[PDB]
Amino acid sequence: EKSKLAKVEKVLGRTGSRGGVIQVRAQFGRFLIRNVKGPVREGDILALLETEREARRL
Amino acid sequence: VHPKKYGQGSRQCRVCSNKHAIIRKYNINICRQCFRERADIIGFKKYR
Amino acid sequence: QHILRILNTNVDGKEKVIIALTAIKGIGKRMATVICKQANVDPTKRAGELTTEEIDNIVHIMSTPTQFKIPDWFLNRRKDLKEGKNIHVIANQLDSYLREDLERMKKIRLHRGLRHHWGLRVRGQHTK
Amino acid sequence: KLNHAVFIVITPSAIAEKYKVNLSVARAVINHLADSQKLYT
Amino acid sequence: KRVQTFGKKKTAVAVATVTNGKGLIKLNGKNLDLVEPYILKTKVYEPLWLIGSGKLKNLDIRIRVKGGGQTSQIYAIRQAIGKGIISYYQKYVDESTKKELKDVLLRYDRSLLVGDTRRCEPKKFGGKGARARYQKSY
Amino acid sequence: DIKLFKKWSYEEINIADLSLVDCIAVSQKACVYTPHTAGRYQKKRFRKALCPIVERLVNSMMMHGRNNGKKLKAIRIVAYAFEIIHLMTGENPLQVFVNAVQKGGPREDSTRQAVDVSPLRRVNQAIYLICTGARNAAFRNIKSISECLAEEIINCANESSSSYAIKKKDEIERVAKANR
Amino acid sequence: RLLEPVPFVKTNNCIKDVDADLFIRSYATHLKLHNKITYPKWCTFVKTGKGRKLAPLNEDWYFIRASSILRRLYLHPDIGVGFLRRQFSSKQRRGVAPNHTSLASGKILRSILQQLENLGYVEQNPKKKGRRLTTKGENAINNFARYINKKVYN
Amino acid sequence: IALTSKNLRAIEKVCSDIMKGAKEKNLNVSGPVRLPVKTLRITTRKSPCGEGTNTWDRFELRIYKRLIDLYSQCEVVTQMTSINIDPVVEVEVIITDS
RNA sequence: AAUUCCGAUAACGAACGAGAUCUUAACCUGCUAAUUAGCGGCGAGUACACUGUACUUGCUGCUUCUUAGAGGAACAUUGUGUGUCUAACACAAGGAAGUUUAAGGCAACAACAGGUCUGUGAUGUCCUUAGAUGAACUAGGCUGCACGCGUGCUACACUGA
RNA sequence: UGGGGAUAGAUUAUUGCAAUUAUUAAUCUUGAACGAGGAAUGCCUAGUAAGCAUGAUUCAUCAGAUUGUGCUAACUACGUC
C-alpha cells in the first residue's frame, strides 16, 4: 500500500514508555498531529500510511 | 644451609624483609606496600 | 579411475591427489607431501587420474624413506629406545606399536603408565 | 552435499550455477573459456 | 624555489616538499603510485584531479612519510599535498590565485586542509578496553 | 564530472517519497571517488544525513563479528557488487541503489498502537535490512558475497520476495497495520 | 589491470620506480632460467618459518625468496641475516594458545645470501656492518629494472 | 656543561644563571639543548591486600636532562656553575675548542 | 553535570564539598633553542635519462618537520531562535578547538565491628620457646578428582583457511 | 572438509642443583567435542565498541594474567523513567 506526504513543522515532545516516541505537528485544515518513531528534525517530511488516523496529543 | 642465588627465596624487601610483592623494576628492591609509604619522597609522584 | 580403495579407503577422486594421499596416514600432511614429491606423482591432478604404478611407487617411497633424501629428524618413530633404531610404522602396525608401548608401560610402572592404566590424562587438565 | 563433476557472466558462481560444477572446475572452465576477485573482460 | 610543510592524521606524519620542477612526484625514494590499496590510492590522487594537471607541471614534489598505519598515512599524505600546494602559491605565485585554489579545496572538503584531531583515549584499569570493563557476575 | 570508482556517473536520480532524496543526499559535496571517508558523523542527531549514502552502505556492510574493521574488503565487495549489477541488469548501479532505498524502507511500526517511522530512521533501517539480508544469504552458502550483495540490491530495487529487505519491510508494515 | 591511467610523471630509472611483485616474479623466473643459483635439494623438505607449520607448497619459492631479498638489499643498503628473519616472519597459531609472530628459518636465508655473494651480487664488509649490495649486482638490478619497465609499460 | 635533574624549575634557574654568566665574558655556548624527557613510571596496586575492588595508581618520576657545550677555561665555568646550583641539579663536564 | 545559579523567601551571613586547582593529549607562536634530531649547503662517485631522477662515502648556513622550554589561544565569540526573558539553553556561522577542548588525577561530613596483625622491628593481650609455632635441611603437596559454580583463551569456516 | 587442534604418541634442544605430576622449545606423526549456543545474564555513545597485535610487570626458567601502548575505525541514538 501507498505513501502520502506531510512535512514536519514542529517537534512537540518525546513520549512513550521507553521514550522512543515523539509528538509532532505535520503539514499535509491541513495540519496533521503525529506520533513518530526515530530521530526527527524540523523540515523532515513524514511518510503517512493510514492518513485519517489523527493522533491524541498528551 | 643451602640457599640459591636465583628464584623466589633468594631475595627479600630492602625495608621490611617480606619475600613477596617486590618491585625489581629499575632495581628498586622494595615491596609495593612499603613503596606506597615512601612514594612521594623518592619522587614517584602521581599525576595521571 | 575415481573411487579407489588402497590399503585403507581413498575414495577421493574429484579431490586433489595430495589431500587424497593424506586420507590414509600422514594426515599431518608434510609426510604425505614429501612422499608425493619423492614418488613424483604430481600434485596438480585430481585423484581419479592416479596411475596404479604411481601408487606402487608411493608404497615403495613410504617403505623405509631414509634411502631417498627425506631427513632422519623429519622421520617419525626414531630412536624408539631399544638396541635397534626405527622408522614411522604406518596404519594398523602403527596402532599396534602404540598399543604395544602402552602394554610395556603397564608392566614397567611409573606415574604416566599408572595414570594411563587408571584412565587419567598425561599432563593434567586441572580437574578442579 | 556435492553432486558436481569433471565433464559436460564469467563469475565462478555463475558457471557453477549454469553447468552444475565445483568451483575449482568452474575456474578451470573460465580459464579454458577465456583463452581473489578482479576486473572482467 | 622550495617550500616544506606537513600533514598529520592519527600518529602518521607526512612531510611535503614543493619545489620548482616538471611534475615528478615521489614518496620516499619511490614513485607516487607505489603505495598499494587501490581504493585509498584514489584519495591521494584526489587533489590532482581537483586542480588539473597544469599546476603540477611547473613543480616537482617530494614526500617523506613516517609513523602511523595504513589509513593514517593515506590521510596524512592527502592533507600534506593540500597544505603544500596552497602554501607554495602564498609565498611564490600569487595570493588571489591561492585564495581561489583554497576556495576550491575548501568547497570540496575541510579535511584536506586541516587534519582530524582524534587520537586515543587512554586505557583505564578494570578492563582491557579504554572504557570497556571486565564481565561482572552475581 | 567526479564519478564513483571512475565508473558511475552520479548526476541522475528519481524523486522517491521526496524525504528519502533529502536524506540520502547525493549531491556534489557528498560525492567522492571512492568509499572511505571517516569524518565526524556523531556530532549531533541530524549529522548522519551529511554522511554519503554509499559510505553508509559500506559501513553497514562491514558490520558483523569476525568481519569488523576490515573496511577495505567490504568496500571491495560493494565495488564488485555494483559491477555485477551493471552487467546483470540494464541500469546504472547508482540508480539501482536509489531504487533499492526507495522501495526498501519500512514506513510504520509499533512500540506499545503503531506510530510513523521517521525518514532518517527509515533510510538506516533499509540499509541495515539490505546488509542483514546479504549476511543471512552469505553464510556457508557457496555463492560469493559480492554477488549476494548484488542480488539483494537488484531484488530490493525491483521489489520481490527474493529480497530479505522487502520481506522484512512487508512483515514490519503488516504487523503495524494489524496492531493499529 | 597492471596498467592504469596516471595523473603525474613516472621516472622508470630504478627498482624504486617499479612495483615489487612484477619485478620480483620476472627476476625469480630469469634467475632460475639462467641457473645461477641452485635449488638446493635439501631445501624442499623444510618450512620458511614456524608461522607456516606446513610445507611451503609452491615449488618455485626459493627463487622468489632470493628475488625479494635482493630487492630488500637495494631498498636498505646495509643489513644482515636477522633483518631477513624478521622480514619474512609471520603469525603462528599455537593451537589453543594465542598467536605470535615467529621468525623465518635462518639456514635457507643464510644460503641464499651466500650464493648471491659468491656470484658478485652482494657483499660482506666492515665498512657498513652487514651485507650490502655490490657493484655487478647493482648494475644488473638497475638495468633489469629498466628492461622490465619498458617491456611492461607499452 | 651537561645538567641533569628531577626539578625542571631548578634546571631552568641554573640555565639562566650560567647563560648570563657566560654572556658577560663573551663565551661560546651552543644554545640550551633540551633532551627528550625520560619518565620512570611505576604502576602500583592500591591496598596492601587484595580485598575491595582492583584499584591501581600510576606513579611517574620525570627526569630532565639539558645540555650546553662550551669553549673556555674549565675552572671559571665550573666554579660559576657549582656555586650557583641547588644540589638537586647534577652537573657533568662537556667542553669544545669551537 | 553540580544545596550550580537564578528566583521566591522568617532569615541574613558564612564555611567545607563542587567548580576550581594540577597532569597529559588537542592548535599557534615563521619568536626561544641544535646534541647523541632533522633540513639544506657543498665535494665525490654509482646508475639512468637528457637543455635533472635514484643510489653510497667526506666536509659543513638553515630549524618547517624531531625534540622541549617559555608564552599565546574560547568566553558560549558573533548571528538567529526559545527562555519569568532572569539564570540560561537551542540552532547556524565563525573558529585548531564549542558536551566547562578530550582524558585523567585529587576526594567533604558521617559511617560500615567491610578488608588487612600472611607487608612491616606498626601492635595489645593470649599462646609457644631444644621431642620449638624459633632458625634450618631432605623429600611429598598446594596443580590430585563421581562432581558444582566463576573470569579468560580457542573454535565452529568461503566478507574463510 | 584441506574447517576445528582438544588428545596422544614418538624427539632433539634450552633453562636450572632438581624438569617425572609431561618447566619451556622445536620436529614428525595422532585428528576429540564443536553445525552460532537453552533458561539466563554482561559490557558499551567516537578514534571509542569490536577486531588485531605488541611493550612492560612478575622472570634463574614460565602469559592464555594484569597493566600500558598503538594500528585496523562500526552499529545506534544524542533520549526516557
UniProtKB/TrEMBL annotation, chain A:
For this protein, the record's PROSITE patterns field holds: RIBOSOMAL_S28E
Gene Ontology biological-process annotations:
maturation of SSU-rRNA; ribosomal small subunit assembly; translation
Which CDD domains does the annotation name? S1_S28E
Instruction: Mention any one GO cellular component term assigned to this protein in its UniProt record.
Output: cytosolic small ribosomal subunit
Gene3D superfamilies given for it?
Nucleic acid-binding proteins
In the UniProt record, does the keyword Ribonucleoprotein occur?
yes
Print the keywords alphabetically.
Ribonucleoprotein, Ribosomal protein
Q: Which GO terms describe its molecular function?
A: structural constituent of ribosome
InterPro entries registered for this protein in UniProt: NA-bd_OB-fold, Ribosomal_eS28, Ribosomal_eS28_CS
User: Which SUPFAM superfamilies is this protein grouped with?
Assistant: Nucleic acid-binding proteins
Which HAMAP family did the record assign? Ribosomal_eS28
**PANTHER family per the record?**
40S RIBOSOMAL PROTEIN S28 (PTHR10769), SMALL RIBOSOMAL SUBUNIT PROTEIN ES28 (PTHR10769:SF3)
The text of the family note is: Belongs to the eukaryotic ribosomal protein eS28 family.
Name this protein carries in UniProt = 40S ribosomal protein S28e, putative
UniProtKB/TrEMBL annotation, chain B:
Q: Which GO terms describe its molecular function?
A: structural constituent of ribosome; zinc ion binding
Q: Which organism is it from?
A: Plasmodium falciparum (isolate 3D7)
Family, per entry: Belongs to the universal ribosomal protein uS14 family.
> Does the keyword Zinc belong to this entry?
yes
Which GO terms fall under biological process for this protein?
cytoplasmic translation
Per UniProt, where does Zn(2+) bind? C13, C16, C31, C34
Q: Which cofactor does it need?
A: Zn(2+)
For this UniProt record, the keywords arranged alphabetically read as follows:
Metal-binding, Ribonucleoprotein, Ribosomal protein, Zinc
| Protein name listed in UniProt | 40S ribosomal protein S29, putative
PANTHER family according to UniProt: 40S RIBOSOMAL PROTEIN S29
Any one annotated GO CC term = cytosolic small ribosomal subunit
Is this entry keyworded Ribosomal protein?
Answer: yes
UniProtKB/TrEMBL annotation, chain C:
Q: Where in the cell is it found?
A: Cytoplasm
GO process terms (BP): translation
Keywords linked to the UniProt accession? Cytoplasm, Ribonucleoprotein, Ribosomal protein
- Assign the protein's first listed, main location to one coarse class: cytoplasm
Q: Any stretches that span the bilayer, and where are they?
A: none
Any one GO MF annotation of this record: structural constituent of ribosome
GO (cellular component) term, any one: small ribosomal subunit
What is stated as this protein's family in its record?
Answer: Belongs to the universal ribosomal protein uS13 family.
Q: What is the name of the protein in this document?
A: 40S ribosomal protein S18, putative
Protein species of origin = Plasmodium falciparum (isolate 3D7)
Q: What is the lineage of its organism?
A: Eukaryota, Sar, Alveolata, Apicomplexa, Aconoidasida
Q: Which residues of the full protein are shown?
A: 12 to 139 of 156
UniProtKB/TrEMBL annotation, chain E:
Give the matching InterPro entries.
Answer: Ribosomal_Su5_D2-typ_SF, Ribosomal_uS9, Ribosomal_uS9_CS, Ribsml_uS5_D2-typ_fold_subgr
Arranged from A to Z, the UniProt key words for this protein are: Ribonucleoprotein, Ribosomal protein
Do you know which PANTHER family this protein is assigned to? RIBOSOMAL PROTEIN S16, RIBOSOMAL PROTEIN S9
Q: What is this protein called?
A: 40S ribosomal protein S16, putative
State the PROSITE patterns in the record. Answer: RIBOSOMAL_S9
Q: Which domain of life does the UniProt lineage start with?
A: Eukaryota
A single Gene Ontology biological process assigned to it is:
maturation of SSU-rRNA from tricistronic rRNA transcript (SSU-rRNA, 5.8S rRNA, LSU-rRNA)
Similarity field: Belongs to the universal ribosomal protein uS9 family.
Recorded GO MF terms: RNA binding; structural constituent of ribosome
A Gene Ontology cellular component where this protein is annotated is: cytosolic small ribosomal subunit
